[PDB]
Amino acid sequence: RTFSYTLEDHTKQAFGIMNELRLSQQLCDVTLQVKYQDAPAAQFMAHKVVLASSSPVFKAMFTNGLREQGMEVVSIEGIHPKVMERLIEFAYTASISMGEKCVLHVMNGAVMYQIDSVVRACADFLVQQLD
């Protein structure tokens, strides 16, 4: 009496569309303004719900108890713009790539937004690079 179906690639396909929408700057409700020390300021438009799905830190920031009147600007310090870019790409794609010289800075940024997956991968890379 009961019929049930699952599309395994669905989440992969849907995240692909969400990343397309980020890059077109469509349906975005947060702008991250990133200023790190000497480097020129940068900004990143995104979807609060997607960032929240990949970072307990963004989730708490955005789930405030009074719903938001539109597009929010968020000031970020202490993370290089190039690192934030890579973390956002991870959330939207599940992949991240960097040069060996940047692995430490990305791990630092991933600790700051509690992206446990990226923390683990970077830690494991650094340790293999020993001895």
Author numbering: 50 to 180
Article excerpt on this structure:
To determine the pKa of KEAP1 C151, we used a construct containing only three cysteines (versus 27 in full-length KEAP1) consisting of just the BTB (Broad-Complex, Tramtrack and Bric-a-brac) domain (residues 48–180, with a S172A mutation), which has been widely employed for crystallographic studies of C151-targeted electrophiles.
To assess the protonation state of C151 at various pHs, the thiolate-reactive probe monobromobimane (mBBr) was used, as it produces a fluorescent monobimane-thiol conjugate. In contrast, for the C151S BTB protein, the protein was unmodified by monobimane, confirming that only C151 is modified in WT BTB. Positive electron density near C151 indicated that ligand was bound. However, the density was ambiguous and not continuous, suggesting that the ligand was flexibly bound and adopting multiple conformations. The scores overall were lower than for the pre-covalent docking, and again, no one pose had a distinctly larger and more negative docking score than the others, supporting our hypothesis that the lack of clear electron density for monobimane in the crystal structure is the result of the ligand adopting multiple conformations.
